[PDB]
Amino acid sequence: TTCVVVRKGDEVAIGADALVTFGDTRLSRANQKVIPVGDSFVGLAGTTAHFPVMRSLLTGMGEECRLHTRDDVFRTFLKVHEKLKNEYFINTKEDEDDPYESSQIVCLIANSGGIFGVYSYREVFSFDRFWGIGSGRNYALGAMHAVYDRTDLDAGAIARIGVEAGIEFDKSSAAPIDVHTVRLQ
Amino acid sequence: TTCVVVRKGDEVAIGADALVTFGDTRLSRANQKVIPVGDSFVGLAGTTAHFPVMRSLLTGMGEECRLHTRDDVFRTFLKVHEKLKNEYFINTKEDEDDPYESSQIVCLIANSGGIFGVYSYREVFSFDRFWGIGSGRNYALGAMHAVYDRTDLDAGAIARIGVEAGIEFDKSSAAPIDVHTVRLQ
Amino acid sequence: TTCVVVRKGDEVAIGADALVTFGDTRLSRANQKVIPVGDSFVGLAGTTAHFPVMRSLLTGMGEECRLHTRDDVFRTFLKVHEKLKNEYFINTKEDEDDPYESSQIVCLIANSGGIFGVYSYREVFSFDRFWGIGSGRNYALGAMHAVYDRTDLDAGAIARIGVEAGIEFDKSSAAPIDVHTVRLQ
Amino acid sequence: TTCVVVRKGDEVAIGADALVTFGDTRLSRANQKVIPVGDSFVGLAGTTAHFPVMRSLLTGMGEECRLHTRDDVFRTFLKVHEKLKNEYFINTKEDEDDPYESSQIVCLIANSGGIFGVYSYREVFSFDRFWGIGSGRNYALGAMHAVYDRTDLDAGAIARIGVEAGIEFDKSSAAPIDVHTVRLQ
Amino acid sequence: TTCVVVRKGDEVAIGADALVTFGDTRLSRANQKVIPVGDSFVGLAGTTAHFPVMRSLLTGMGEECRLHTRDDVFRTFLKVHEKLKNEYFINTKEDEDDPYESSQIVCLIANSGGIFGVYSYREVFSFDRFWGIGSGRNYALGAMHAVYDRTDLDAGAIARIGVEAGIEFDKSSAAPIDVHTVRLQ
Amino acid sequence: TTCVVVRKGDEVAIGADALVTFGDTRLSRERNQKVIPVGDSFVGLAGTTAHFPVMRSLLTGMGEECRLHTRDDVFRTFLKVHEKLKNEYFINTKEDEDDPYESSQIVCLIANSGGIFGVYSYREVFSFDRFWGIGSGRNYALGAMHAVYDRTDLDAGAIARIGVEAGIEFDKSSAAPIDVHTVRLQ
Amino acid sequence: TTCVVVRKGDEVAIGADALVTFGDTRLSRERNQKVIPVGDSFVGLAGTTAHFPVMRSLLTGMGEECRLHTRDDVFRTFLKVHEKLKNEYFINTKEDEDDPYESSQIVCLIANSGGIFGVYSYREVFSFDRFWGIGSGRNYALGAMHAVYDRTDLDAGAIARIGVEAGIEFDKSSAAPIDVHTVRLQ
Amino acid sequence: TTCVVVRKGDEVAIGADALVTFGDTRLSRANQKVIPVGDSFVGLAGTTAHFPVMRSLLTGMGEECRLHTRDDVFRTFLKVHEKLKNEYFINTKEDEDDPYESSQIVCLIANSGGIFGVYSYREVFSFDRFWGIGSGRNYALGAMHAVYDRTDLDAGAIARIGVEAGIEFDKSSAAPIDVHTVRLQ
Amino acid sequence: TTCVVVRKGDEVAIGADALVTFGDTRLSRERNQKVIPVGDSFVGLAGTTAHFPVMRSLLTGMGEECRLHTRDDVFRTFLKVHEKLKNEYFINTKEDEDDPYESSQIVCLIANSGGIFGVYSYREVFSFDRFWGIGSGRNYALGAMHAVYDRTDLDAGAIARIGVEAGIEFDKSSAAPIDVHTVRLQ
Amino acid sequence: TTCVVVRKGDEVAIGADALVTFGDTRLSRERNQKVIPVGDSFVGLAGTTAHFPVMRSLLTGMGEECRLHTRDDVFRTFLKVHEKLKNEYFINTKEDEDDPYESSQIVCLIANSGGIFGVYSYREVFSFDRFWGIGSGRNYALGAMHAVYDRTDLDAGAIARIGVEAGIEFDKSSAAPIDVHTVRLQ
Amino acid sequence: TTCVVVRKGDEVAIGADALVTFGDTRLSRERNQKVIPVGDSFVGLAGTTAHFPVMRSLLTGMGEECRLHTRDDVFRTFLKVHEKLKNEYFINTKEDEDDPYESSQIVCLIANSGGIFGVYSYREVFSFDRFWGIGSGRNYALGAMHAVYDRTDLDAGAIARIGVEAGIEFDKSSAAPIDVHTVRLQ
């Protein structure tokens, strides 16, 4: 996976690749990993096997899923954690003494309030210019960093360039590219 | 095991091999891994040792076992998870940070509503053309992909060809082949 | 251990060896692993160290220990699981994602209702001709398979031949042989 | 440790060595591992570090510590398990699927009712002639087996010979030898 | 990370580097690891991924976050442990038999009451001259020890020198340096 | 990688995908790198891209002493490849008899007018009647080729393409474009 | 694999299954690949299919210097097989005395007019009086042959078939058809 | 650490070294590991990181901390275990099947009632002449054993000699030596 | 480390960061230590700082016998480097064919008027058309150079600088200042 | 161990602690054991006390053939030390290029009128401009020396003492007394 | 095992326990097996009883070429012991410089009129001023001897006895009776 979020000027963008697999076996589809949730867009980290519950949970919430500030995203995903446990019987533990782990990344978020990342359903970050997640994200970060200050490139174009870089070098990332842009409030 | 599901035109099909073992020792029988549940057919993944409880649970449910839509299959297997714990004292945990694991696959499903797969009793997928599970599934996927667009082949015939491929190359798959077809609503 | 069950004609049989050990050290006795439970015979898998509680539990049950059908054996051993936990404070967990393990085998059963095997106190199987368990069972299965269709051999004789094979080749199986026969209802 | 129990004629005996250590460091004393409990004698298996609670528990019980039959010893040590958990906050788990382990041995017992062994606070055995436990027990078993049928040797003398053998060959067994004899009822 | 605390004369100081990472990937920022909590300064140990909850918890407490004595810091962080569990569903276990582990370090603290360190949310230390934590702390300790008795250097200057040493030699420490000083009561 | 060989009628074929990587990082490339013309044979290389240059240089440099049209010839030729690797390039290729089957011991598939062959551990040579495949996508390829081999409208080249297509469809370590070469049997 | 040898009366027999695989993937084949005629003896090969070609080529190429009709002859012959593997084919077959029993050290079973034999680690040779078997299905085979050996209506060939049948019945790594050869004792 | 207790004549003594570390890094101090608790002295085993809670707990108890007999010490430290769990949320588990482990040692104790050692907060020992704990204790035991019968040496002098030996040979033991003596009742 | 090579138009470039460490402890230094002038080529060294001195001493001492302007020349030259390491400096550099891709087998990148090259395990030599990079920050560098390569205002030197900048930005084991050298193609 | 070398102005210094152990058990000693006079140089030995006697005997016995006043001389000298260890004392000192940085490969620090040096794996020699340190207490020492190096009142000897003091203060495997030797640069 | 050596005044002593085992099983014995008279020296052997016979046979057979009265003599003698073990008895005794301290590398303690010595890995020889000990009970022994060494009424023999007594008291792998030999210094 290569998923990125970008912020520049009065616009934000979220970009993602399309590859979905059950382990090493590719699954052909009719984008599955980027979800519209109200007027936000959420890009899911991790294995395809865990997408259906997350899509069903976030899209079903509706009004109680508030994402336009860091505190709102934080309180919302605390509620996502509780719903996973009580309704779907899924565990999402966090221990403070654990080091950084990629499998604890939940999602990136883009809306008119800004661009955000969620770690372990509890730790929420806000980003000023860009960030990315998944197996192709290091390639994406280098690309977006190299081109961000170009005057002819908006947030959507920078996000596309980020995903292109991930697809170019990562075997676990593949075309087509899905990009959505949103104007800041 | 090689178990497949196929959808083409106004018909769906489910196909499975017959090999059942306790570990490395083969068990001779009078098909054990494909179960009629109401008007659906369910193909069980995993070891033969865990078949009896699953067969007893699914066939005993009756009316509360609804499988003709993705949401119905989802809610039904959430109930299967609870029954396993409360009635049969069997555990089926899911952690979100876990990667893809073959031992979390529950079953494939075929009925007049379509063809489905269930992962970890919670994550439900719908398939457009075909899918397969078990040790011989990679051979089966290649075979079904190669022949799906043949105008002379219906869903039942494609499923047979899928199971044939699994039997040909996988030591843990064996004849005879069991195939059932159902007309879409 | 080599323990077998056989069914042929109007008779069933259960056969077992006599070797009992605490680890690698042999224990001399005055058969310990085959138990009469009402009008059934139960052959215990696993270490000698866990025999006393199982013998005490099964023989103490009496009327609530019903074993003449697959469903009865199933419900009975669900109750055995609960008694082990609540009365004797012993754990018998099952996880669905676990593969086949020999240490989960509980027993073989022979009575006028047929011949049965119990796995993990929850999964119950019925056998048509024969089966065996323990370290010498592969030798036993080969022997019984080779001689089953002999017109001069009844169920008791086939079971003896099964245990003989286990004793011949397995260091963890030893004479004398204990065989009991029961007429089918 | 080398601890043995013997039964012959109208007498039983229990024998033990004297070595006590905290790990590899020897502890000099004013026998610590053989305990008088009412009119029985109990020989403790395992590390010296766990002796004080066991001595305090068994000797404090008094009348509710009944040991003269297999069933009595069984029910008594079920109560010992509960007291360890509820009063002393010590765990003694048993899983049925576990293999034989020396660290699950609790004690040998000798009284006018016979000679007994307790495994995992739940599984109780009765012995006809002799048995032994601890690091020197294999040497002891060979010695007692070789001399048991000697007409000039009683149960006490056979037990001494058993402990002598353990002391001779096992570095974790040491003199002096402690032997107690009891007449059968 | 290199974070230090210093006490000398009528002044204390806290010093920290600026490097923040998600694993091996650096995160560019607009100091994130040093937090003003009332009139104290708290420097956070461990991964950047766990900063947001800790910052949100400590700054939200307000009056119930008392830090000017060893006992106050102790009782306050016991409450931090409970809030993490009950409000944020985060675990912070301590076992007494565990050895020293760097991942159990919580923070260093500097205020008008003195300089403190917190280990595992339960064990609180007070320091007379200085201490440091994180991957560059050994370099920092050597530097501060070498220069502490210099008559021209106050607590703030000694802390800067400590962080400089960490930045010089540790790849996981980077400029700019953040230092805050506070007068003792 | 998905590489296949096929034999049907008077024709044989060899097919391969194009993906080449240094570990997990893709390398953009130029004609197919893993299928090599060696005289009038075609050789498809198994394993990591990092070990391709020496193998390409060795096989193409041999010329006349690289004889591949029979099982025995392929066998003796690759014994010589083993010796050259050790003595000229200082590379080790050990075989122990007690070792089990390992995919990292696969060397190559071969197609020429003498037939279709596979080489394991530079010493064990097999001949195939209808088809075979190697690499991470080969199980998908085998299922596809098995399912379509008896089709009267499909020749050896077409069956090989279908094999590589299946590997590309399902294996993340296999990618288009597909390279196929056909040769008439002698 | 299930391979057995039997001796009874004036006849010996060798029996084997037909399943051959590259790892977990089955290879379709042609006559039985794992039983080899070597002069007037029959040799049944243990272990992975990947190591069959060199062993077949070595044993069948020896000819006159491959003498197998006594325990000492089989012993000296397979010492020479060990040396040829190392010097000609550059394959290692080490033995350490302190190693325990390992199934991957089994080389073959042998049947000829001199008797029935087994070879372990190319150095340790055994002679059998009634029967033995090797491979993943051998425990089932041993039980079957033991149960039926004393039947007056069954000769060595029939007992061997029954042994292989038992292996095929219960072992997933054993498959039909069954190959049996009988030889009269000298 | 080297901590010892000695008993001779009408006097007992407790001796300890001064080295305190956070892992491999030494901490300079203004003795931290020997605590006065009422009229007893308690020497703490294990890492410096766990000292503050133990010091705070034992010194805060006061009258309910009774230590002058084996049974009193036993009941007192059972209460210490409960307080650690309920007040400080610290775990101190004991399993009976565990072997001897140095990390389960709690403390040595010296008072007018005698000299004691506590293992796993539950198992209490009394010593006749001497004992020691920590990384330098083997050197200390050899020294004290060699000199105990010297007529010119009292309990305090023997304890000093014990700690001297630990300091001489153990890198994790360091001067100065702290010794306290108490007259037996 | 972040080291890159670039080729565009009539120019090539090599770029590297400056960070050098003994393990986790930084060493302050002097000109760039990891980029070496060897005749009229520039060589960027992969791996730990601890192994730089012998490699610098060996390559710069060779002189005329160190020929690097073609793939074959670089190949033969580094075969000789392998032999010198063993015979003169008593250092081992083994390669086994069955080993997978490993980053610790990377030797160097090379830039000269003949083109841009990479050397793996002293034996496997690659030529690059546009760019490549090695070391802990190379993935960031590859993404940056790929994103900007087709810019008409950027030459090979500028693209290399941008590559190293990206590595320094995100990798803790890469640090300023940046060292870049450009060479005109023959 | 804490051993340091310093260079400042016209003087160099070498400093070391005194702690020597067989494993965890301290050995009481006599002058400093880990700093050796070799001609007019001083050599500070890294690693376990158990390996000191052979190294002391070898270096002090060499005499004239032990030349240490330049980087190349130190390099050639310790290549000879490696050969003597193998041929005379039957001790192995292997280096593999693909190995990462390891503290157990550190041999010694050196101080003489030619400068201050460090030797890694008997083959890789470094020269230092201001200071360096080795052993378990070296990180504390580096921080101390870095913090005080630019003090106008401190010479090379005083900076080295301060370095060893820091190691002794914080490292349990470092202990007083401190041994320091100074030498004037040529 | 507890074995010690002591030096005080004009006398040295060597002391040892008597316990000998094959693994965990005790072997009953005869005079002390682990202390050997070699000419006019006494040698106490470390390690398992299983390796005593060759060492006893080698050292006692040497005679005149076994010189032990100085550190250099002991050193050269045990270099020769290493060579004899390899060439005559086919036993390996490797040393790698990068290895840490290991108790299984201890060879022996030595006492004679020249002083008291210890040998590590057949190559590293130490001389002791007051005392030392080896084996599983040595830490107890060191503490005892340290505590009593300065007693005016105790000679070297008495201090050694006290050392072995301490080992026997606390170590399960040490047992009575105690064997002590004293020798006057030259």
Residue numbers in the entry:
A (entry chain B), B (entry chain B), C (entry chain B), D (entry chain B), E (entry chain B), H (entry chain B): 1 to 30, 34 to 188
F (entry chain A), G (entry chain A), I (entry chain A), J (entry chain A), K (entry chain A): 1 to 29, 32 to 188
What does the article say, verbatim?
The data could be scaled to 2.1 Å in space group P6, with unit cell dimensions suggesting two monomers in the ASU. A closer inspection of the Cm-BPH crystal structure reveals two malonate molecules from the crystallization buffer to be bound per Cm-BPH protomer, specifically intercalated into the intersubunit clefts of the rings from the outside. These hexamers are presumably stabilized in the crystallization process, allowing for the tight crystal packing depicted in Fig. S5. A potential result of the smaller radius is a different conformation of the pore loop as compared with the Td-BPH structure. The smaller radius allows for a tighter interaction between neighboring pore loops within the rings.
The second hitherto unknown bacterial proteasome family member was primarily found in Betaproteobacteria, hence its name BPH, short for Betaproteobacterial proteasome homologue. Unique structural features, however, like an elongated inner pore loop with a highly acidic sequence, distinguish BPH from its relatives. Confirming an initial hypothesis, our cluster analysis shows that BPH branches off from HslV and appears to be its direct descendant.
